[PDB]
Amino acid sequence: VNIEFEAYSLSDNDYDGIKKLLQQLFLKAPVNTADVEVFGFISLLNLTERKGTQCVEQIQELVLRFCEKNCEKSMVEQLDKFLNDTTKPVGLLLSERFINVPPQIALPMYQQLQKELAGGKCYFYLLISKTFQVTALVSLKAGLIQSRSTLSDFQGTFMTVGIALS
Amino acid sequence: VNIEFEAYSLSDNDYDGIKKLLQQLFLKAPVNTADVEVFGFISLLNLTERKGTQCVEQIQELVLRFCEKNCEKSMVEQLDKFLNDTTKPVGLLLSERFINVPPQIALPMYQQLQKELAGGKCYFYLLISKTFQVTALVSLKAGLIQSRSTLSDFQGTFMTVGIALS
Amino acid sequence: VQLQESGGGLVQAGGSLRLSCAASGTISPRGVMGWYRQAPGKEREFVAAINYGGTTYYADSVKGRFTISRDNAKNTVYLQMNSLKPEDTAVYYCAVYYYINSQRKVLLYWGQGTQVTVSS
Amino acid sequence: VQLQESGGGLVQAGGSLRLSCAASGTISPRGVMGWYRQAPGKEREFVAAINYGGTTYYADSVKGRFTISRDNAKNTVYLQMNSLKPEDTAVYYCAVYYYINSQRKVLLYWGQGTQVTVSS
């Protein structure tokens, strides 16, 4: 099972709305302590579970719906339901066990996801990114992959991890 | 991973106490509807989880403690903690998602466990049995096995199933 | 809206049956009526469907053997089943559904189904 | 009860170190003092232990190279480490524990550990 989506066609305020969407997600969970922009989350999943596969139906359906023709302004509203609907698997999985790691944790996890994506643990990622001042490029990557450990054993199943890089 | 325990050395009131212990367990959960004695439960487990392996530590420790020399009257008290301690993985797993199936469901599941034990899904079973009037034999079998489906897809992970055959 | 299936039964291989599904109420002109089958221990699969305007759809497994038709005045859909095979043995259910758009189907009503058995 | 490790450091392979672990309070005569080591990215493993009566225990990896001893008047345990190998590089922790019975060990106190580095 693989599901990989990338969009380079976003508007500055589409990026800017989704960033706010992710930010509430951050503020809404436990916070932890002990150029380019990147924001999003990396959630570990178990596909032998009901939750695991119930999520995937939602994720796959969102991606299917993102493959609509004029489906671009809608991105920001469709993401609003997706991740903020607790009446739903993905919005529910992000209210429970969402942890906010500081950037020194986050960068290694981004970079390894970025390696693993380029070339057994089901990971769910949603990741926006801006490269500048001006804006040179805006990118929403979001996918379901099975790979090598990105978590440092510091993460459990249905544990989600916050990315926030500036 | 395999863990299999059988004891044919029980007293009539050791059997009779454990039966009461299992019975409260039955009364304490949702009840479902749509010669020899056998009583116990069959609980499906996922070993890639924390819960799954936290249970096994308890199960393995109970079995280790059952391999003590004079450890027979203690069986009834040690089982009392084991399965009724919600401050503990196994006593907690039996308070959540314990389902009581009628005997027409239960017998097929016993019989298949009895086949699979004789000769990938981690199952946890605890099973007492009397063969008579008089008492000819009393048996406490209890183990951790990985096998073929005993549940009829009617069971989920960390779902436990009641056995009660008369 | 209730859907009432009928015309199931036992038949020999190569034989024919005619299933009927009557609706207790008026089906919207947006309503598609479809037949689905469920073999023992299998999921429910699509067999054939017909829209209000008479456009027909068939599964590849029944194409050239089965013929769906609809009577709008009787609120009834028919499935003529010819050249029956042992693999056509299933419970056959009718359903009413409509499309919101090209990607979104809403199933509204299911019938209770009718048994078809094809003996060798 | 605090346990204070000392005598860690850098040494060449084949060399020797003497670790010491002092307890801030009186250890019960039922108390066993043990050394444990944790290499980078590894679990904490047993090295050696000594009971109040001077009975010694060693891991097979250090047998014939290391010698544990205890001073009951100073509440101090020593680990003489001879013929050091690169694989002896770890943080070394002392602990106080006792046996309730033949199967049940209770760990009471852990020290903060001392670094040992064995260079090639």
Residue numbers in the entry:
A (entry chain C), B (entry chain I): 57 to 90, 121 to 205, 214 to 226, 289 to 322
C (entry chain A), D (entry chain G): 6 to 125
Copy text verbatim from the article accompanying this structure deposition.
Here, we report that the nuclear protein BCCIPα, but not the alternatively spliced isoform BCCIPβ, binds FAM46 and inhibits their PAP activity. Unexpectedly, our structures of the FAM46A/BCCIPα and FAM46C/BCCIPα complexes show that, despite sharing most of the sequence and differing only at the C-terminal portion, BCCIPα adopts a unique structure completely different from BCCIPβ.
To confirm the unique structure of BCCIPα and establish the generality of its binding mode with the FAM46 proteins, we sought to solve the structure of BCCIPα in complex with another FAM46 family member. Cryo-EM images showed that a small portion of the FAM46C/BCCIPα-ΔS/Nb.1 complex formed filamentous oligomers resembling strings of Chinese lanterns. Nb.1 binds at the junction between BCCIPα and the N-terminal lobe of FAM46, but the details of the binding interface are not resolved by the cryo-EM map. These results provide strong validation for the unique structure of BCCIPα and the binding mode between BCCIPα and the FAM46 proteins as seen in the crystal structure. In addition, a comparison of the cryo-EM structure with the crystal structures of apo-FAM46C and the FAM46A/BCCIPα complex shows that Nb.1 partially occupies the position of the FAM46C C-terminal lobe. Given that this conformation of FAM46C and the filamentous assembly are induced in part by an artificial nanobody, we do not assign them any physiological significance.
